[PDB]
Design a protein around this ligand. Structure first.
Ligand SMILES: CC(=O)N[C@@H]1[C@@H](O[C@@H]2O[C@@H](C)[C@@H](O)[C@@H](O)[C@@H]2O)[C@H](O[C@@H]2O[C@H](CO)[C@H](O)[C@H](O)[C@H]2O[C@@H]2O[C@@H](C)[C@@H](O)[C@@H](O)[C@@H]2O)[C@@H](CO)O[C@@H]1O
Ligand SMILES: CC(=O)N[C@@H]1[C@@H](O[C@@H]2O[C@@H](C)[C@@H](O)[C@@H](O)[C@@H]2O)[C@H](O[C@@H]2O[C@H](CO)[C@H](O)[C@H](O)[C@H]2O[C@@H]2O[C@@H](C)[C@@H](O)[C@@H](O)[C@@H]2O)[C@@H](CO)O[C@@H]1O
Lengths: 297, 297
């Protein structure tokens, strides 16, 4: 099966870290910055990594049963379909937010049909993605008590990320990797860090405007629809890098060349006119050829 | 280009009317209730219909500027990327909820980056998908005043569907078509109603458990990832129907046949053999061939 990337304009695809349309590309201020996102992680031959899911419907969501232990509230986590999280494959349940060291402002609803016959099933809560009480790898996270959790104790809910704020005393760092928790000898299951290629190349980030307050631009290393595309195709990786063109949807003019590496990320060589950030956002990526990892952009 | 459907297990794909994993499929008990969903609508050759778009990140969301005029609040609608909604040109902005005659309980956030440097950008509001003031095709919907909208007047927000309840005096009808054009006009570019073809066939609905309170099972006529697949492929339609086999994900043994029609829905003959049988939810649809309308399931 021949390799390809989606024939969909970039601005119709979702961020892989929040369910939001992509509205830009950027390179990092520090071109040596190492991303280690846990969502949007897949190889070019379609092997999922981290907490990455096929569907954008799972991005930055949680599921589980709310508990109250001696005034300490929390969620006992499950996968989003309600089946148990076994921690065999991922550092947290699939889809789990990968924003670390910050305050996650969640909206949630009861999800058991028996709890959905009448009344308001909804609530909201803050979850800190820090401290030992944030241990999603071990199946539990602490909820901040907002005096409105008691009606939900013992109930199964699904939670979604509404907005994010900085932890007191810290900036909101969207490159931070959550400390998901360790379990004795068990593997972390983390998707690996991506080290910048150097030699003029820079990792390309796809961005979405989103209410990460104090830093309202969420970077990711692949659009979500690239992930499902690769999972669907399972195309053998026949070279060390894939040469892409980013093409005008109307004129079919090549607007810039990119390299995709087997690990599932893209680079460019930024030029005089600002890097990829200056490109129109309605272009279409097209696979041209397998090339050497040393191919010169 | 040969037609195909996604090679993704059903239970990893999203509903096309709410952003939730599919947890089953079923035929309706009321064969007389006609589906005319506006989301999840696409032809097999990749032509989007109604309010349907490509990404699951857009499903059941709204965007626009909150206003207060003549003693009532509302939203002036835009497309989800912030570009203008071309009023009178599709039934409503793409992704707009297609639940009619009910109460849409929305969660929202300010989306202008200048409004996202500090503070809580979030709120919630109820929107009635009924009355003359529900006029999304004209560019506006009324918001119910909850005494917490003032700070948002003049601000651009994105809204997401958190839960749904019935309109007072009515039952919650998940097959109702919203009156998008109010009393002014029938909305243009409505995706058409669907009727079963005969030969014992019944329309198949993909289901998700979701807080549509009083009926927490949301039916749709295609998985969202089927929609993006067809848009991506643009495969010409070459027969009356596309025969699909729903196969075991590991052995590829056929578990049941389905016929997909060019209008973008599928049928089955349910209850084959009196039926003390249940299909699993983790099968994979595989395109077998184009077949005539007379192909007997
Ligand atoms: C038994 C009874 O009449 N309870 C009402 C309550 O209605 C119940 O709960 C709602 C969600 C719905 O499932 C009803 O069928 C059910 O009887 C009222 O809730 C409102 O009900 C109307 C319909 O009659 C609308 O569905 C409306 O959106 C509902 O308000 C929402 O749900 C409420 C529980 C509140 O949270 C409210 O803020 C929401 O907007 C309420 C309110 O009038 O009063 C009784 O509890
Ligand atoms: C002006 C001011 O100091 N307001 C604070 C507020 O902090 C501001 O708003 C938050 C969201 C964030 O942008 C801060 O940088 C900003 O100074 C406080 O909010 C808390 O801020 C801490 C960080 O210092 C956390 O981010 C925390 O999650 C915030 O609480 C949340 O947002 C608040 C506005 C409330 O809505 C609250 O429910 C949220 O938890 C608050 C509370 O300490 O106090 C002032 O309002």
């Amino acid at each position: 099966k021949p390799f390809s990337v989606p024939n969909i304009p970039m601005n119709l695809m979702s961020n892989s870290r929040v369910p939001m349309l992509i509205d830009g590309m950027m390179v990092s201020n520090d071109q040596n910055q190492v991303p280690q996102f846990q969502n949007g992680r897949v190889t070019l031959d379609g092997q999922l990594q981290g907490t990455t899911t096929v569907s954008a419907a799972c991005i930055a969501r949680m599921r589980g049963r709310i508990f109250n232990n001696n005034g300490n509230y929390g969620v006992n986590l499950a996968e989003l379909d309600g089946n148990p999280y076994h921690a065999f494959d991922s550092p947290a349940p699939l889809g789990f937010p990968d924003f670390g060291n910050c305050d996650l402002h969640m909206t949630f609803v009861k999800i058991n049909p028996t709890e959905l016959s009448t009344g308001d099933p909804s609530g909201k809560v803050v979850i800190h993605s820090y401290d030992a009480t944030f241990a999603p790898h071990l199946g539990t996270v602490k909820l901040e008590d907002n005096n409105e959790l008691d009606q939900f104790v013992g109930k199964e809910v699904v939670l979604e990320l509404t907005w994010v704020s900085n932890r007191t005393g810290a900036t909101l760092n969207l490159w931070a990797v959550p400390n998901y928790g360790s379990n004795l000898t068990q593997a972390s299951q983390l998707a690996p860090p991506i080290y910048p290629p150097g030699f003029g190349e820079a990792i390309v980030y796809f961005t979405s405007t989103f209410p990460t307050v104090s830093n309202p631009k969420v970077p990711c290393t692949l659009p979500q629809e690239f992930v499902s595309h690769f999972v669907n195709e399972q195309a053998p990786t026949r070279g060390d890098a894939a040469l892409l063109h980013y093409v005008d949807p109307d004129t079919h003019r090549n607007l810039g060349e990119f390299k995709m590496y087997p690990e599932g990320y893209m680079t460019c060589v930024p030029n005089a006119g600002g890097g990829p950030q200056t490109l129109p956002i309605n272009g279409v990526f097209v696979f041209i050829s397998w090339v050497s990892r040393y191919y010169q952009l």
